[PDB]
Design a protein around this ligand. Structure first.
Ligand SMILES: COc1cc(C(=O)NC2CCN(C)CC2)ccc1Nc1ccc2c(n1)N1CCCC[C@@H]1C(=O)N2C
Length: 128
């Protein structure tokens, strides 16, 4: 019952590594953008986001529900749109990363909703 968070985060990590990181040519979004290859990236993108640091956030148990998890996932696509443009080949790839994530989230919807409530009802019964 305290593994409710450990289970939720384990599922989130596998979604990232087994489904999102499996999108064809998604390798530029696997890791923080190398400043050596695009120098001005951190001068135009103020909230940079990638899959590797989503996984580091998962390992720190930052996401207690899929809402905050999706906030950082959608941030990858928002940053590609702001940097690469809406019609970019990179942006279309990031859109498919976001697509396969929403896909497998509704795939596990009934299961995750259980974990999400058991995590939060434990959060409130612990501070109460
Ligand atoms: C070849 O490319 C890269 C290589 C490497 C690299 O470490 N490779 C070397 C490793 C050592 N080895 C000895 C030699 C190879 C890193 C980044 C590249 N490019 C890239 C990454 C991410 C984005 C990106 N590019 N782009 C492209 C346009 C800017 C924005 C857009 C974008 O959103 N994103 C997230």
């Amino acid at each position: 019952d305290d593994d409710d968070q450990v289970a939720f985060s384990f599922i989130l990590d596998n979604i990232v590594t087994q489904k999102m990181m499996a999108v064809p040519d998604s390798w530029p979004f696997h890791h923080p953008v190398n400043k050596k290859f695009v120098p001005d990236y951190y001068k135009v993108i103020v909230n940079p986001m990638d899959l590797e640091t989503i996984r580091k956030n998962i390992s720190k148990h930052k996401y207690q529900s899929r809402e905050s998890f999706l906030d950082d996932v959608n941030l990858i696509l928002a940053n590609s749109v702001k940097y690469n443009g809406p019609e970019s080949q990179y942006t279309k790839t990031a859109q498919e990363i976001v697509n396969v994530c929403y896909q497998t989230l509704t795939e596990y919807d009934e299961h995750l909703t259980q974990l999400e409530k058991d995590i939060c009802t434990a959060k409130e019964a612990a501070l109460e």
